Ligand binder design. Structure first.
Ligand SMILES: [Zn+2]
Length: 240
């Protein structure tokens, strides 16, 4: 069962050829992992709200990106903007328009395989990027992690199982996203992460009660997309 899905293998081909985007960012980096730590200090639930108009699982929402982002700036600890084009209907231009208008931290969520895609994130105004362990070698992951740090971005390193976590911990990731969409496995992964690493439960969250349960295990933030795209007001239920 360790095959990459058809759509992800196709995305990696699109990412390798992704043209770089010529631009200047309009404000400095605002740290997403530090703001998560500030929310935790204040005891307020930290949700990274994702913007995506489509997904390989069949999400299909037309929602204006500025209006979603304005509303989410009221509630969310940060935004995650999908910039993968074929399956999520994201775009660099949509990231640039959102990052020119909100002043909470922005994660560029895409499938990064080369340095120019981190240069594109910085030039478009994102504050950090997603790196996914399973599509990279360990040497590439360590190099891309250092490349993101060289701009002042602590990247979100996305892991799906214990082997991926083993790699993320070996290379000294400080910001890890735990994705699954089994209870003892999830508890075990969480429990392997050191106190100094900000941990994000990515996807597989539908109700407030799972957020509460994850918080007791020390999860620091929650990356949630589809449900918020279909009703942005759902984030009020989640932060209660
Ligand atoms: Zn997912």
């Amino acid at each position: 069962p360790r095959y990459l899905k058809g759509w992800l293998k196709d995305v990696v081909q699109l990412s390798l050829r992704r043209p770089s985007f010529r631009a200047s960012r309009q404000r400095p980096i605002i740290s997403l992992n530090e703001r998560i730590l500030e929310f935790n200090k204040r005891n307020i639930t930290a949700i990274i709200a994702e913007y995506k108009r489509k997904s390989p699982s069949g999400l299909d929402v037309e929602r204006d990106p500025i209006e979603y982002s304005k509303f989410m700036e009221r509630y969310a600890v940060g935004l995650s903007i999908l910039t993968e084009e074929k399956y999520f209907n994201g775009s660099y231009e949509t990231l640039r328009k959102i990052a020119s208008s909100v002043s909470i931290p922005i994660l560029m969520a895409d499938f990064i395989v080369k340095e120019s895609q981190i240069d594109d994130a910085y030039n478009l105004g994102a504050d950090t990027v997603l790196l996914i362990v399973k599509i990279l070698t360990e040497r590439e992951l360590e190099s891309l992690l250092e490349y993101a740090r060289s701009y002042g971005m602590e990247p979100l390193i996305g892991i799906n199982d214990e082997n991926d976590l083993d790699i993320a911990l070996r290379i000294g990731a400080r910001f890890i996203g735990i994705h699954s969409h089994n209870k003892e496995n999830q508890r075990k992964l969480i429990s392997m992460i050191p106190s100094n690493v900000v941990k994000v439960a990515a996807h597989g969250i539908s109700e407030r009660n799972e957020i509460e349960e994850l918080r007791k295990l020390g999860v620091n933030a929650f990356l949630i997309g589809s449900s918020l795209m279909r009703n942005p007001e759902k984030i009020k239920e989640f932060i209660l």
